[PDB]
Design a protein around this ligand. Sequence first.
Ligand SMILES: CN(Cc1ccccc1C(=O)NCC1CCCCC1)Cc1ccc2c(c1C(=O)O)OCCO2
Ligand SMILES: CN(Cc1ccccc1C(=O)NCC1CCCCC1)Cc1ccc2c(c1C(=O)O)OCCO2
Ligand SMILES: [Cl-]
Ligand SMILES: [Cl-]
Lengths: 148, 148
Amino acid sequence: SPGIWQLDCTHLEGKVILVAVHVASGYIEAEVIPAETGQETAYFLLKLAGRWPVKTVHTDNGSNFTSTTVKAACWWAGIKQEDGIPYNPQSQGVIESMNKELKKIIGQVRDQAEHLKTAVQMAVFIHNHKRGYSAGERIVDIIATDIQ
Amino acid sequence: SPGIWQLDCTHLEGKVILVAVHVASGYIEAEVIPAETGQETAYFLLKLAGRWPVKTVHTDNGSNFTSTTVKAACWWAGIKQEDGIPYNPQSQGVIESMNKELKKIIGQVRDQAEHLKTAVQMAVFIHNHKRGYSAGERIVDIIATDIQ
Ligand SMILES: CN(Cc1ccccc1C(=O)NCC1CCCCC1)Cc1ccc2c(c1C(=O)O)OCCO2
Ligand SMILES: CN(Cc1ccccc1C(=O)NCC1CCCCC1)Cc1ccc2c(c1C(=O)O)OCCO2
Ligand SMILES: [Cl-]
Ligand SMILES: [Cl-]
């Protein structure tokens, strides 16, 4: 559980927002890309695994589960690649709610930048800092406890 | 000290590698950009502060210290912007050694990707995982202790 992440893809302004969520804490990382490809997903995972101890990634769809480039990034980074089937149905709702919340925050900051990528990083900041612990505090505490 | 980071700019393949180092742990984040501008530095700091609790950033040069866009990103993210003058002379050497080490790692992975950005993220991964604790373990432990 300290090492489990979930990929999530949502759309805004004709672009794709790729999100990785640390399941146990709700902490997120995100980026803006023109379209979701295996190559871009692979690169996103390489970045993620260099920054946090990623043991397992539940992929966001079957195309990314199948992608040889995504499989190659998971091999490279020592990540167990898994499907994202919501065997627990509450998983769908949680991700849906998170996407709605993210878009709401993006709307609240949207006029503070020209480019969507900038607004998305402001939204990541606000989400991770919101408290009563924050998601950012929770992920560090969870991982630190696991190390000790 | 848990919240203190240092910016660092190095060059490879006619491009710029922008690095943020967590001073107490040696943990790094990095990106590749065509050239170091205030805007790109500002965006890099916004990303960093959404991911880690950044209290203070020592800027890499006077242009980034002066930059109104960098100052604006520091204001936005609640970061104290400081100079990077090595009042302790060993600071120069440490950064110089880190850049040499990074470039060595990049050379060791360079043929595993077409694009420099990919090789840089592999290098970040290897640096942060190298042990006997790793930099990634150190940063989490330092910040977790501070939270509690
Ligand atoms: C040049 N932009 C001016 C601007 C334009 C429109 C509205 C507000 C502002 C404004 O000054 N925002 C306040 C402040 C908020 C904290 C972050 C820094 C900007 C901002 C900007 C800076 C660096 C970038 C950008 C962008 C962008 O416009 O998206 O895009 C990606 C590449 O790095
Ligand atoms: C398409 N590339 C094929 C390739 C080309 C040359 C040498 C090796 C390989 C190769 O297959 N490497 C193994 C593996 C290593 C772990 C990561 C996934 C690739 C790799 C690649 C994937 C995603 C990207 C890339 C790149 C890139 O080439 O830089 O660039 C930035 C955008 O996301
Ligand atoms: Cl798409
Ligand atoms: Cl430059």
